[PDB]
Design a protein around this ligand. Structure first.
Ligand SMILES: CC(C)CN(C[C@@H](O)[C@H](Cc1ccccc1)NC(=O)O[C@H]1CO[C@H]2OCC[C@H]21)S(=O)(=O)c1ccc(N)cc1
Lengths: 99, 99
C-alpha cells in the first residue's frame, strides 16, 4: 500500500520479541532505537544527527517484522529521542517515495 | 517521479531564486535549511533530533519549488548540517511512501 505524510509515519515493528513504534525516516541512513536488550555481539559506533553526536551499540543480523516483511538488519541502540527506521531497512522492504 | 532509497534521496530545490540540494525526509516534521537570508517576519523555534536540540528561525509563506512543483510553505533556517525537506512540504507536492 501507500502511506501519506500529513501525520508522522509511525509503524509497528516486532523486534527482540517486543512490539515497538518506529518512525519511517527516509532522512536516516540507519535504524536507531531507544535503549533495549538485543542478543549477540555488538560494536560501539558514533551516530551524528541535527543536534550532535551520540554513542550507540551496533547489532548485526537482527530479525525484524515490519510492514508484513520478515527482515534482517543492522540495528543501532542508544539515546535517540524516538525510534527511527532508516534507509537500510526501508530499502529491504521495497519502500519508495513518489510524487 | 519515483525515488528509491538505496542512496540518500537528494533533490534540487529552488528557494528565492537560489538552487539548493536538499534531502527528502519523512522523519522531519518541517523543512529546515542551512543558514540563509530570507525576507519577511520570522519567529524563533526549537527543534530536536538525534544528538539534541537546535534553535532555528521560522519563516512562514515562503515560495519553494521542487521538481516543477511549486509550494508556499513554512521554512526553518538554522545550523542543520544539511538542507532537509520535511513533511509540511512533501504533503503539498503529493509525495507519499509506497511499498
Ligand atoms: C530524528 C528525526 C525524528 C528528526 N530528524 C530527521 C532525520 O531524518 C535526520 C536528518 C539528518 C540527516 C543528516 C544529518 C543530520 C540530520 N536524520 C538522522 O538523524 O539520521 C541519523 C540516523 O541515521 C544517520 O544517517 C543521517 C544521520 C543519522 S531531525 O534532523 O532532527 C529534524 C527534526 C525536526 C525537523 N523539523 C527537521 C529535522
Amino acid at each position: 500500500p501507500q502511506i501519506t505524510l500529513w501525520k508522522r509515519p509511525f509503524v509497528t515493528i516486532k523486534i527482540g520479541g517486543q512490539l515497538k513504534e518506529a518512525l519511517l525516516d527516509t532522512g536516516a541512513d540507519d535504524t536507531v532505537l531507544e535503549e533495549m536488550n538485543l542478543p549477540g555481539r555488538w560494536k560501539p559506533k558514533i551516530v551524528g544527527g541535527v543536534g550532535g553526536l551520540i554513542k550507540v551499540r551496533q547489532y548485526d543480523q537482527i530479525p525484524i517484522e515490519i510492514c508484513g516483511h520478515k527482515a534482517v538488519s543492522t540495528v543501532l541502540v542508544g539515546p535517540t529521542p524516538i525510534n527511527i527506521v532508516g534507509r537500510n531497512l526501508l530499502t529491504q522492504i521495497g519502500c519508495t517515495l513518489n510524487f
